[PDB]
Design a protein around this ligand. Structure first.
Ligand SMILES: CC(C)C[C@H](NC(=O)OCc1ccccc1)C(=O)N[C@@H](C)C(=O)NCc1ccc(C(=O)NO)cc1
Ligand SMILES: [K+]
Ligand SMILES: [K+]
Ligand SMILES: [Zn+2]
Length: 357
């Protein structure tokens, strides 16, 4: 019955010095925030302050070497920023990038704290740079530190090590970093829906396929739902939630839900190629609100059509605030390949979840 919101325009200062039209724009977060004002959603939320993550907090998921290298970019000359960024897959770095990544993480820590202390029921974090491609030891795909992964560990650090955290990653890309950070971990259930195209879609790794179910005691706690072929939209995402995400999540019984909420599967996204609607994102949000006593934190990842992400994320906040959820068509037939994907995931995870048996 209270929704928190965190936004700090300081996270706009991370910018691409070599191509100012790179799609991971400063204006992503300001546009999303402005839309919350236009729709009169902001005043309905409890405003949560951003803060820097500490280096000790980054160490919850990242190696000291990786922390130190990204920190070293704070005062680099342009030539060295360009050279360092080129050492990673799909990274640009400015002198503000490290601090902006710290603010993204710390904003979500404060949001998770507000939820778990009972100050708010749920929250939204309008943050950048994104996080889910960041690995323990490297930056990747516009991401420096894995905000969502860190937030899960932060949450466990103020409650208990075994706090059950569900991370739902509906960004159109696989969150390779989140999967790897938690791959051997049965306390954090990672579920990702993502365009895959048999490895043709970024991050171009078979790690994103449906047969990567986790490792050791984490077998069953990594659920990859990869899309191939068709332009997927609300029917396919709703079906994946009905057949896979929600049955597994209910059986896991999370105590906190983090959404790696990229909006690049949205209709109109320049690089996702998918057609999830703002109503579709609202439907998925409302579904997730049935878990964890409503304790849901929505964390912006990707999403690159400024109007599309602003409308889609605002509709999620409207859902968190309790507004009436949309009625959508669960009977629209799926793209053929989507049924194939769902059946492949079901077969892979039925050994681990009785709700699939
Ligand atoms: C119309 C364009 C916006 C297309 C887009 N191009 C693109 O990302 O530009 C990157 C760029 C690098 C250097 C200078 C300028 C720009 C793309 O999808 N390129 C393909 C090759 C790709 O996969 N690029 C890498 C990539 C990594 C992470 C995410 C994400 O959002 N993850 O959550 C998206 C894309
Ligand atoms: K994803
Ligand atoms: K896991
Ligand atoms: Zn993405």
């Amino acid at each position: 019955p209270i929704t928190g919101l965190v936004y700090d325009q300081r996270m706009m200062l991370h910018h691409n010095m070599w191509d100012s039209h790179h799609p991971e724009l400063p204006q992503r977060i300001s546009r999303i925030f402005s839309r919350h004002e236009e729709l009169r959603l902001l005043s309905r939320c409890h405003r949560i302050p951003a803060r820097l993550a500490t280096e000790e907090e980054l160490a919850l998921c990242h190696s000291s070497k990786h922390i130190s290298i990204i920190k070293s970019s704070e005062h680099m000359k342009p030539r060295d920023l360009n050279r360092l960024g080129d050492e990673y897959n799909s990274i640009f770095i400015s002198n503000e990038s490290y601090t902006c990544a710290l603010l993204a993480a710390g904003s979500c820590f404060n949001s998770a704290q507000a939820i778990l202390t009972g100050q708010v029921r749920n929250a939204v974090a309008i943050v950048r740079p994104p996080g889910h491609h960041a690995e323990k030891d490297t930056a990747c795909g516009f991401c420096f530190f894995n905000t969502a992964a860190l937030t899960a560990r932060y949450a466990q650090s103020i409650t208990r090590e075994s706090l059950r955290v569900l991370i739902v990653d509906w960004d159109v890309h696989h969150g390779n970093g989140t999967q790897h950070i938690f791959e051997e971990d049965d306390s954090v259930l990672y579920i990702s829906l993502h365009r895959y195209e048999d490895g043709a879609f970024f991050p171009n790794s078979e790690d994103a396929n449906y047969d990567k179910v986790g490792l050791g005691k984490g077998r069953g706690y990594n659920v990859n739902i990869p899309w191939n072929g068709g332009k997927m939209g609300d029917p396919e995402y709703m079906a994946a939630f009905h057949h896979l995400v929600m049955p597994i999540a209910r059986e896991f019984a999370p105590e906190l839900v983090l959404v790696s909420a990229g909006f690049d599967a949205a209709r109109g996204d320049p690089l996702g190629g998918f057609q999830v609607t703002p109503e579709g994102y609202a439907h998925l949000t409302h579904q997730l609100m049935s878990l964890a006593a409503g304790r849901v934190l929505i964390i912006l990842e990707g999403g690159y059509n400024l109007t599309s992400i602003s409308e889609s994320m605002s509709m999620c906040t409207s859902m968190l605030l309790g507004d009436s959820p949309p009625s959508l068509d669960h009977l629209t037939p799926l793209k053929t390949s989507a049924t194939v994907s769902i059946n492949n995931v079901l077969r892979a995870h039925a050994p681990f979840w009785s709700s699939l048996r």
